[PDB]
Symmetry: C2
Subunit: 582 residues, 2 copies
């Protein structure tokens, strides 16, 4: 790219002339990711990337990384990065009585000059009747000296209403967005047609594509997967499901927003002992759990959100931020599946998974050498190996520890592995709860802190002795156990009452819950517990399908489907092949 | 020395502190004896106070003011939550209290017996029935038995609802325990220092002509720069000096640490509300960047200076300059010269550790390997810049001093560079932030989305604001440090800690000096001591105490030109 100049605040404007590139460079997709310290801004040097980066550097906020600029007009919040605050963002149509202001996002719908993507610019200066903007991927030649705008648009005020005129004539300006609590004159948030949220069944032409060994056993990752499952993804590989590109766009927005909503709920829980007590976490760990949250809220690498998605809308059921899995099936096995038998133009929405994980690890505070800790269990073998691939791609060295036998302490009481190498950075497949169970009887009135071992007769190291060791940096962080506990659903609801992605939930039976019908779930019959309005999964080609999204560093990492003949998906229920289509 | 004896609960290591085996001169000053966890100073290896701060830190994320001797811990009434700097109430209960000791409590010994002058501190690690197990450093000196995570067990007697603990030594005095709780029932009222000990005294040296010639070295660049700005002078009569008691210094150490946190809380309140913030006269265009600075760099302040009124009536802070504080050179170097050249008593200059405290702060900062020092073309700024450069060098940083803005330019990519073409990306400035603010005071936040700083110019003319507000430049002190030194913060401070012993009643309305929309504060004038009004000033370094110095003037109001006065702390 080329530096064209700077918008106010010292924000660089670049040319995204992919032309001057050869396909050999474009093989490493890390060179296209624009970052400011460890915060992903976007793709060099797109319009969306300039807008996030400008808002980030000048105000410390960003907005959900939607695939196309016209999509921004449907967002109703900006994310304050340092504390993850959700700030209200309003939309105003061109011709609005709400005049455009300095710093507003100016959005173009698709069409004309901005054909299929629409566009975004930042309004940088109000020069009387002209509206100066800065933007990327429109101008590609250096700007005059000292000019800190890319284009100037004329604004007309007639009858208390404001109308901007583009410099192009076949385009359509949707309007401007202002971060404010005032909703006067604002557009109500667009609602996706329910029909586009329907999950459809599909069938491949059966030419025996999957009759033999379609996963390669020689690839240790795929063979490890085969050792735990066989040459199998689902019961009938010729059957798969599709969702619309619009549904995926909605899943991408919901994933990002819900992540921030869960962090707010987690913070509300952690600030009140009466709420925290509902999560069944040993009191003795409370100070460390709180400590973890205060300093590592941004250190979560990956999680998984499960939804109910059909013509009625999108509803979250759960968010496992601690021990999420299914990454291998969705990011690797489904790719081989598509390769082997799919020939349409759609795509597997979890295709970008590995790359996204690598970026998270590269921009984390992990140590150079990461010990991967898994249980001696065949499914965990491939999950651990899939993550090891992402770690290596990001530049880390690793050692996989199966069970706890090779761990011991050195003469100074520091944990070491089998090669006598100090252990101080762990990525685990173990659920934290497994570690909690080892000290569930340690009273916080008797002990000042957890009496973990630092030496032992038979050099016997327990899981809890490594995870709670101050010198060991653990992923996922301790605080991640909060999100997945159903005790948080009533809290999430009180913080965002009647949110389009939430289900009415409470600790008591409301009058809303009686009229609506509700499920009683223990901290599971249908009608101390939580009560939630009923909202069962759609049944599609003989199975109840649940839509799942992966979060990676708090952002969307892809989507996959889980299906079952029962109305209740279990951890053993199958991943089903998913293809996103136009 | 430093032998690992075992661990207390939570994985906290217990080390033996056998100094003997080596140098005295170096145990103190060498950075190798300062215990840290990541970037947070824990203590002196491997003392009792150090183990208590680190135990509390690693296990709960909290610490307590780093007082000189264990027994003084008993007088503290709060713990500091490190991440957010919250002030947590801390209560003290005497031995024999109806308030029982809890696991995690600080157990303090007064001086006396086995704990001679220092007193002692331990943490209560386990309540095993009628025993109380503790962990501590600087008592045991042999490894503990395998798997034992306490250094001593002590018997507790429960007679009539009152708990009394018995020590294992028999010539000692256990003051009691401290618990972090908001419940004050059965708790000790915070000790008040007798006013007499807070008096500043005048004293004189035996005049043998020690100051007749050049007592400052003009061959030393730093000392010569000081002389070029002042002559061979520290004050008007170098045979005259002042003293304060070790007890007063102890009081100034505590107050300094507490007041820094209190000012951080008032800063937060200010930044959380536009109504409050508008009172500080900071260009509104700068507001989002100022808040970002506060949010991300609260722990990044390097050094500041608090000015107090101190005498028999108490200790009262007047101001905290967290942006452009000076006097470090006079207090940390010139007074060292002065004492050396003419003082022959047993006391010490309380700002003697200033240079080393600053070096530590820089070493533990996020400053970049190469730091440009930016100063204006002003004679007193020359020596302040060089004093700070010396601390940066000591901490491992490379530097280059920029005087005025002329050598600064932009390369082809519009990035800032110095006269040698090196990229400028980390600056420590002697310039006050307000000087830069002034350059963009007319930039409206209604017309411009952000500050229209230059990234190029017809005559390659770089302004101070074009550097300090550049995203790629990491500036010290951070932009938020402009808030503590503004008088408009005094009423906020008061509202947050009403009737606090170190504050002066101040409000925007009259509840009585009037300071310029006005602030009204209770009258409270500086004491006159040997012909001058004397102000007591402490340096903060990384939020911690870095020393004390005195400033005096014939007038009741000390000015920046006011003289630093030789200061000795004595028993």
């Amino acid at each position: 790219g080329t530096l064209l100049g700077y918008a106010p605040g010292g924000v660089a404007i670049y040319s995204s002339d992919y032309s001057s590139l050869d396909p050999q460079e474009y093989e490493d997709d890390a060179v296209f990711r624009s970052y400011i310290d460890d915060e992903y801004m976007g793709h060099k040097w797109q319009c969306v990337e300039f807008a996030r980066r400008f808002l980030f550097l000048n105000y410390g906020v960003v907005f959900t990384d939607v695939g196309m600029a016209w999509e921004i007009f449907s967002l109703r919040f900006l994310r304050e990065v340092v504390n993850d605050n959700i700030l209200p963002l309003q939309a105003f149509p061109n011709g609005s009585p709400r005049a455009p202001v300095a710093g507003a996002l100016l959005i173009w719908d698709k069409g004309g000059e901005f054909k299929d993507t629409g566009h975004v610019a930042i309004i940088t200066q109000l020069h009387g009747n002209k509206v100066r903007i800065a933007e990327q991927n429109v101008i590609h030649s250096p700007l005059p000296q000292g000019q800190q705008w890319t284009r100037e648009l004329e604004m007309v005020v007639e009858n208390g209403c404001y109308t901007l005129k583009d410099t192009f004539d076949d385009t359509t300006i949707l309007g401007w967005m202002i971060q404010t609590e005032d909703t006067e004159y604002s557009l109500p948030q667009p609602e996706i047609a329910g029909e586009l949220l329907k999950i459809s069944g599909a069938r491949l032409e059966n030419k025996g594509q999957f009759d033999g060994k379609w996963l390669d056993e020689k690839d240790p990752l795929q063979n490890a997967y085969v050792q735990a499952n066989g040459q199998v993804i689902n019961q009938d590989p010729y059957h798969y499901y599709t969702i619309t590109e619009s549904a995926e766009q909605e899943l991408i927005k919901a994933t990002n927003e819900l992540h921030l909503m869960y962090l707010h709920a987690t913070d509300k829980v952690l600030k009140d002992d009466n709420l925290l007590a509902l999560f069944d976490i040993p009191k003795i760990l409370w100070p460390r759990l709180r400590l973890s949250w205060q300093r590592r809220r941004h250190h979560m690498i990956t999680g998984r959100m499960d939804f109910c998605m059909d013509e009625r809308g999108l509803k979250v059921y759960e968010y496992n931020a601690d021990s999420a899995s299914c990454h291998t099936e969705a990011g690797l096995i489904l790719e081989r599946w598509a390769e082997q038998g799919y020939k349409g133009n759609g795509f597997n929405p979890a295709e970008g998974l590995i790359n996204e994980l690598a970026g998270a690890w590269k921009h984390s505070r992990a140590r150079p050498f990461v010990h991967i800790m898994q249980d001696k269990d065949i499914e965990e073998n491939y999950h651990a190996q899939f993550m090891e691939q992402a770690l290596h791609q990001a530049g880390f060295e690793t050692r996989i520890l199966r069970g706890l036998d090779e761990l011991g302490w050195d003469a100074a009481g520091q944990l070491i592995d089998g090669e006598g190498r100090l252990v101080n950075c762990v990525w685990k497949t173990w659920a934290w709860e497994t570690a909690f169970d080892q000290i569930r009887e340690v009273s916080d009135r008797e002990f000042a802190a957890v009496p973990i071992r630092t030496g032992h007769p038979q050099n016997e190291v327990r899981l809890i002795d490594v995870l709670l060791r101050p010198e060991v940096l653990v992923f996922e962080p301790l605080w991640t156990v909060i999100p997945g506990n159903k005790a948080i659903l009533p809290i999430l609801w009180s913080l965002f009452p009647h949110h389009r992605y939430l289900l009415d939930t409470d600790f008591t039976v409301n009058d809303e819950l009686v009229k609506t019908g509700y499920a009683v779930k223990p901290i599971i019959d249908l009608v101390k517990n939580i009560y939630q309005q009923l909202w069962c999964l759609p049944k599609v080609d003989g199975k109840y399908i649940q839509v799942c999204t992966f979060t990676v560093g708090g952002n969307y990492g892809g989507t996959c489907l889980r299906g079952d003949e029962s109305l209740v998906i279990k951890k053993e229920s199958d991943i089903e092949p998913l293809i996103v289509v136009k």
